[PDB]
Each structure stands twice: as structure tokens, then as C-alpha cells.
Design a protein around this ligand. Structure first.
Ligand SMILES: NC(=O)c1ccc[n+]([C@@H]2O[C@H](COP(=O)([O-])OP(=O)(O)OC[C@H]3O[C@@H](n4cnc5c(N)ncnc54)[C@H](O)[C@@H]3O)[C@@H](O)[C@H]2O)c1
Ligand SMILES: NC(=O)c1ccc[n+]([C@@H]2O[C@H](COP(=O)([O-])OP(=O)(O)OC[C@H]3O[C@@H](n4cnc5c(N)ncnc54)[C@H](O)[C@@H]3O)[C@@H](O)[C@H]2O)c1
Lengths: 426, 426
């Protein structure tokens, strides 16, 4: 009756998924696949901490996931691997008959986006885009207000991954430590080992899901609407070089690397039903954390400035606020229109509980498997968001030229219905 | 010894310029040219109120400015006419040997942008772009911080004319009244008479100067940097139709007009020295007033949410703020780094004084004439900002295709020096 789940990659983010599953007694954690013994060790400690038995470890090189996927007992897998490993891990999972929870990122190539959907359609094995910010308390509250008609008809939104990643892109290489050095690549630890190389070799919207995901759900993208085209402008890169000099001096070998990834990459996107979206990738500069959300329609306007707390935003509703022409604090609105799912299950995610928005994301994953129902953020959505990355890179190489975004649904977007957070349970 | 100034167009904005000049005893207001007797009447009342003698009125049709320009006593003129009249009024002014203060807007065509500069170079008569938001107290404070090196090297900025104009684009037609009806065109009053037609017939960045101007001064545009290219995305238009129905019912003839101007138009702009700029035109929807400024560099980040007051923003300076990773209120920073010009001349613009940012703008205009010095926002800048409009329209017609922005300076941008607000007087 319970769901048997394994993990491909149990690094820092895979470990969060391990803790979420480890806390549920409707899930048995069967196995881990990860070639790093230190990462596996803390994942196993998360298990011991929750009173669940250890997992079978597949730590023999990069290809040992192939052997874990032969386990017929395995129902579903979480893929929390580096960006370059996403496609290989997920399709091999679906081909082995394993339902996939796919961590976010962009695609390495446009080609893998199509291979996700086409492999999933052939195998009949569904895949969930694990976009956690779609389950952020304020975002879910705003979604609820949009559905209540409080924003009227939406015309425009903004959002973006705007989060200082300098302390994560560089470290010493010591296991367990970030922001303690200027090393990246083979000798560095966690994301510095692999993510930072993408900043050296590429220039584009490398991380579009956190900003676009909320807007996707609010504007019915792939569910009565879809994304038509985009154009990407990239600023110069200055922040990663400056950080390396300020932390580890001019004498470091790494002070010599020219970074291709501009500090700010902005992407304009046209939607079928008239809306427009602007994303911003901002990870190599000093700043507070803020994804820079704007949801704007004919009767409502919301803008945030924080990391998702009720009071960390501004809101204006003309007809409800007596045409005051002044921002209200978002606080009372986010609390009044807290999504039923959060109001019901709050104490599983926060307070007594744990995980926050991540609890709710992985809860949907598990409940969709148990109930044998389609994921609300599915393989078509993954492919769509993922495609923003290679198409932004092509736009930048073509000095901002407009790239057409493919329709990965082949017409299915027209009549598909929005099933994201449409009840209070999952 | 004093400057003799006339006015082409004395509508509501021209009247502000009349009041500014009327309050100075280093200026004599000689004449007005305006075919609307009601507008002339309140301009004359502004004169009587300040104890200055009445002006010669040239109110005989649209072409009566041509006769006012024959007055050899006239040193300079302010042009505060409708957008479609800007080019004709300004070049005729320069050809008559009159120094021009040009009100802001965009260009009707790309062609007039070149004609401004080429007429000014031939006649030797300079023209000032009257961008008042460049003199906004918080903006001037931020400019000062940028020049002090507090933001480090700038990579990115945002800004935009985001101001609910629905009550101005439609009125009854009664003289002196806005937001009191649903009429526009020949029977409507003030800006509803002419501006609203642009929303019917065009779709683009119709008003770029308020957002781009501050960034221009901070990034040294046309003064060691310049604008390379742009791409414009337009959302659907819904807000003007909705406003007409909510105010004057479905039965109005105007409920039938399909508006071409999308509610949100965003424009990405590449700068020569690596910076990028995103503008937003937002005038046909409910919202508080906020131009949505962002100034972002390697050591500082500023974002506003208000209409320019010290506390209406957030700021983060890594090295000065102990790497707190938290927004500070902009209040103490805007006050501490108040531009010397404001600190010195505060009481001429606010408190005992009058005009605010507009006092400082028109003060620079007058002091540059008296001193026979080049304007800091000159004819090349006008042409540049103005060009954003027709090029955005072309981009939207071409589904976001990238338009090259001309170099109106012909290489002069490389060695030209930033002279905007570089002293405490003008
Ligand atoms: N949604 C979120 O809030 C969120 C947050 C952080 C990271 N992420 C995403 O999670 C993914 C991983 O990020 P991370 O922070 O955990 O990085 P990490 O370096 O800590 O984890 C990567 C792990 O993958 C393992 N790995 C590499 N190749 C493998 C292979 N071939 N087979 C099995 N395991 C392999 C590594 O040994 C490591 O343990 C990325 O896609 C990242 O963008 C998402
Ligand atoms: N910088 C700012 O803060 C600011 C603010 C508002 C408006 N503006 C700009 O000022 C300009 C005018 O706007 P407004 O609000 O004063 O509009 P308005 O309708 O009140 O004024 C326009 C005036 O021009 C006159 N006019 C029209 N054709 C003329 C002609 N051929 N010769 C002489 N006069 C003529 C009209 O009779 C009217 O009095 C526009 O470019 C607008 O964008 C700037």
C-alpha cells in the first residue's frame, strides 16, 4: 500500500527529498545511487534520525544508477543530480518503468527537452517538475486570489532566480563547507564542483523555473495558454571575478578565468492569451534574496521584496481598497487568502512539522503516485521551462534575436486543465 | 542681463514651466503661443500671482507660434505641446535662433530624431531634454552614491513610466477637469484630447524618458557609453476598455474601440560598456505610482517602491552593511547622500520654495543659457530617448525583433563627459 522510492543523487538537495520521504510512513526508502561516499553518509544519517532502516547504496561510479533501476520493487525515483546528468538519469528511470521526480534547472540542449516528453509518452511513465516555489505560502495565497478573480484578468508578470550563489559556486573543497574558499571544479565540494563550470562555458537563463513556475500556474501555461517566444539580453560578467579577488586574492589561478555568464540575464516571453513574462537570472552579485515577483492584472497588482513571508510585499486592489492609489502591505492579504492546502496542512510543513514549501511539493508527488493521477506540473512543463535555457543562449549568441519556444504538448495545451493546487490536500 | 523666455503650448505642463520662470527675477516671460484661450488664461493668472506683467498672446490657430518666433527679443523657448507637435515646434524654434527646452515623450517617427540633431548642429542652437525625474531627490542621491563608488561597477538597471493615466486619458471635456468622464479626442480636455489617440493607433514604448533618464546619467550614456539595441514585447490591451465600461457603461460609443497599445510594454536595451536596461510602460492599469527603479552593481543594489521619498525604497551595500544579506530601508542612505545641489538649494524647491525636481530642471536650463554652457541632457540625448519609441513599435510589429539604436552623436559619445549635476548649483 506504501510507495517505494529510491534516489539518484543524494547531494545536498537530494538529502532534502530524503528527509521529506523519511518522515512519511506511507513511503519506504529503498535505495540511494551516488558516487560520493560522504553525501551517502549524511543521507543515511537522515534515515537513522527518522527511525527508518538504511538504504541499499549504489556508489560504484557514475553509472551505478543503471543497476539500482533494475530493482523491480522501486516504484518512483527522485533525480537530484547535476544539470548535465538530469536527462540521462530521468529517461533511464522512465525506461526502467520508474516514475520520476525531476529536480529543477534548465536543459543542456534543446534536444533533451523533446526526449523527456517523447520517452514519457512511449513508456507511459509520468514525470513531475519539482518546482517548490510554486508551493511557497505567499505564492499559493496569490494563486488563490487570482482564482477568486481579485486580480481580474492578468496581463503581465515578473519573477526570477535572484539569489547570491557566489558562496556556493566557490568553496575550499572541504566536505560540508560552503563560502570558505575560491575553488571550483573537480577539487571543490557540492555545487562548486559542477555548477560553476556552466558560468565559465555558457551565457543565458541558466535557472528559469523558480521565477516562471508561479506565473505558469497563475496564467494557465500549457493548460489553456502556452509560451510562444522569447528574447534574452545578457549584461557583462563582473561579479564572479570580483568575488574571487576579494576572497582569495589576485594571486589565485582562478582570478584569470574569463566568465561568460553575464551577471544579469533578462528574458521577455510572449504568452498565447496576451500575457507577457519577464524573467531575471541574478546569482553572481551581492544582494538580499528576492525572486522579484510581480503579478499584475486589471484589478490587482502584487510585488514582493523578500523570501516569501506574508508581510514581505506590496499589494493594490482598486475596488477593494477604495481607489486609495497607495500600496497596502501584503501581510493581511496573504494571511486572509492563505491557500486551503496550507491552512489545512500547515503543521506538517512548519511549526511542529518540517520542510515548508518542499513538504507540499513532495506530498503532491507521493499522493499523485498513490492515487495513480497525473502530476499538475508534468513532463511537458519540465520540457517547456527547461527549453528557456538553450533558447536564451541562442538569443544571446544572436544579440537578443527572438527564439520560438516549441509546443511540447502538440496541441494538448488548448484543452488541458489546470490541476495545480486545486484542492486542499495535494 | 536677464533671460527672455517664451512658451509654445501653455497647457497643464507648460503652465508648470510658466510658474517656475514666473518665480525667478533673472527671467522675463515675454510671450505665450497656444490656440486654447482657457489654457492661456490660467498661465496669465500664474503671472499675475507672481507679480510679473502679462505676456503677449499668440492664440490665432496652430501656426501662430511661427509669428512669436519672429520676436528677436526672445532668447529661449519652452515647448510643452502634444507629442505630434514636438518636432515642428522645436526645429522651427532652433531655426529662428531660439534655444529650446523640450518636454519629454517619444518620437512619432525615427526621422524626426535625426532632424532634431541635424537642425541643432547646423543652427548652432542647443536643445535641452527636460527630464525632470533626473532631478528627483532620491535619484540624485543615488547618482551621488554611484559616483562615490558605493555601487561599484554597474551592470544593470530598470525603470519605467508606471503611472495610472486612465483619469487623464479620458475626461468629460469640461475645462479644468480630469477623471470625470469617458471622452477622448476633439471633444475632450487636456491630454485626453491628443494623447489617448496614440493608444488607439500605436503599440510601443510611448513614454521612455522618465525610466531611462536616471540610468542614462548613472551609466554615462552618450558620455563614454551609449545604447546599442533594443527588443520590445507588448502584452494585450484590456485596461482602457475596462475603465470605459466601469466609468461610463457598455452603452458608450467608446466601449467599441479596440486599443492597440498593450497595457505593459517591456523593452530590453544593451549598453556599449556591458550594462543592460529594462524599461516598462504601464499607464492603462490600476496601480500605485511607482517608476520601478533598480540600480545594480558589484557593491550596491537599490530598488524603489514609491514616488521618490527617502524611505520609499530598499538598499543593500555588502561591504558597508556587514554582509547582512538583508535589505536596509533606503531612508538613511538617501538622506546621508543627498546630492549637494539639493542640500544647498532645497528651500527654493520645497518648504518655503516650490516646484520640487522641476525647480532644479528648469534652473539648469536657465543657468546654462546665462552662462552660455552646454546642456547636460542635450539634443543627442533627446534624439536617443525619443528613438526608443519608434524602434519599440517596429520591434513589436516584428514580434520582438531586435532593433539597432542609432548613434546620433557620430562617435562623439566616446570622449564626451558627463556634466549632469556635477556641481551644487546647476
Ligand atoms: N528546488 C530547489 O530548491 C533546489 C535547491 C538546490 C539545488 N537544486 C537542484 O538540485 C540539483 C542538485 O543540486 P545540489 O545542490 O544537490 O548539488 P550537490 O553537488 O550537492 O549534489 C549533487 C550530487 O549528485 C551526485 N552525482 C553526480 N553525478 C552522479 C551520477 N552520475 N549518478 C548519481 N549521482 C551523481 C554527486 O555525487 C552529488 O552528491 C540541481 O539540479 C540543482 O539545481 C534545487
Ligand atoms: N515631464 C513631465 O513631468 C510631464 C508631465 C506631464 C506632461 N508632460 C509632457 O508635456 C507635453 C504636454 O502635456 P500636457 O499635459 O501639458 O497636455 P495639455 O493638453 O494640457 O497641453 C497641451 C497644450 O498644447 C496646446 N497646443 C496644441 N497644439 C498647439 C500648437 N500647434 N501650437 C501651440 N500650442 C498648441 C494645447 O492647446 C494645450 O494647451 C507632452 O509632451 C507631455 O508628455 C511632461
Amino acid at each position: 500500500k506504501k510507495v517505494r522510492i529510491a534516489f539518484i543523487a543524494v547531494g545536498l538537495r537530494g538529502q532534502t527529498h530524503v528527509e521529506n520521504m523519511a518522515r512519511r510512513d506511507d513511503v519506504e526508502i529503498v535505495a540511494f545511487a551516488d558516487p560520493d561516499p560522504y553525501m551517502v553518509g549524511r543521507a543515511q544519517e537522515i534515515l537513522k534520525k527518522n527511525g527508518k532502516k538504511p538504504a541499499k547504496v549504489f556508489g560504484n561510479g557514475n553509472d551505478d544508477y543503471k543497476n539500482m533501476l533494475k530493482d523491480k520493487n522501486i516504484d518512483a525515483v527522485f533525480v537530484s543530480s547535476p544539470w548535465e546528468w538530469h536527462h540521462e538519469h530521468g529517461v533511464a528511470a522512465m525506461k526502467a518503468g520508474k516514475i520520476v521526480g525531476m529536480e529543477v534547472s534548465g536543459a543542456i540542449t534543446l534536444e533533451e527537452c523533446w526526449d523527456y516528453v517523447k520517452v514519457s509518452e512511449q513508456t507511459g511513465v509520468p514525470l513531475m517538475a519539482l518546482e517548490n516555489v510554486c508551493y511557497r505560502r505567499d505564492v499559493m495565497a496569490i494563486l488563490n486570489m487570482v482564482r477568486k478573480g481579485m486580480f481580474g484578468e492578468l496581463v503581465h508578470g515578473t519573477g526570477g532566480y535572484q539569489h547570491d550563489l557566489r558562496p556556493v559556486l566557490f568553496n575550499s573543497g572541504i566536505n560540508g563547507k560552503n563560502g570558505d574558499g575560491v575553488e571550483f571544479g573537480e577539487k571543490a565540494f557540492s555545487e562548486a564542483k559542477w555548477r560553476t563550470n556552466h558560468y565559465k562555458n555558457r551565457n543565458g537563463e541558466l535557472y528559469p523555473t523558480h521565477g516562471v513556475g508561479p506565473l505558469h500556474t497563475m496564467m494557465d501555461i500549457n493548460r489553456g495558454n502556452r509560451l510562444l517566444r522569447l528574447s534574452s539580453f545578457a549584461s557583462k560578467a563582473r561579479g564572479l571575478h570580483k568575488y574571487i579577488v576579494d576572497k582569495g586574492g589576485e594571486s589565485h589561478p582562478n582570478a584569470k578565468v574569463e566568465w561568460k555568464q553575464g551577471d544579469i540575464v533578462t528574458t521577455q516571453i510572449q504568452c498565447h492569451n496576451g500575457e507577457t513574462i519577464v524573467l531575471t537570472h541574478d546569482t553572481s552579485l551581492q544582494r538580499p534574496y528576492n525572486l522579484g515577483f510581480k503579478v499584475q492584472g486589471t484589478e490587482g497588482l502584487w510585488e514582493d521584496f523578500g523570501w516569501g513571508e506574508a508581510a514581505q510585499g506590496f499589494i493594490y486592489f482598486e475596488k477593494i481598497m477604495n481607489h486609495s492609489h497607495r500600496w497596502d502591505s501584503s501581510e493581511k492579504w496573504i494571511k486572509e487568502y492563505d491557500h486551503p492546502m496550507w491552512k489545512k496542512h500547515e503543521q506538517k510543513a512548519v511549526g511542529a512539522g518540517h520542510g515548508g514549501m518542499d513538504y507540499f511539493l513532495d506530498n503532491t508527488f507521493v499522493e499523485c503516485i498513490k492515487r495513480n493521477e497525473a502530476f499538475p506540473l508534468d513532463v511537458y512543463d519540465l520540457a517547456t521551462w527547461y527549453s528557456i535555457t538553450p533558447l536564451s543562449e541562442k538569443s544571446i549568441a544572436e544579440n537578443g534575436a527572438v527564439q520560438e519556444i516549441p509546443d511540447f504538448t502538440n496541441g494538448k495545451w488548448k484543452n488541458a486543465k489546470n490541476t495545480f493546487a486545486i484542492n486542499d490536500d495535494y
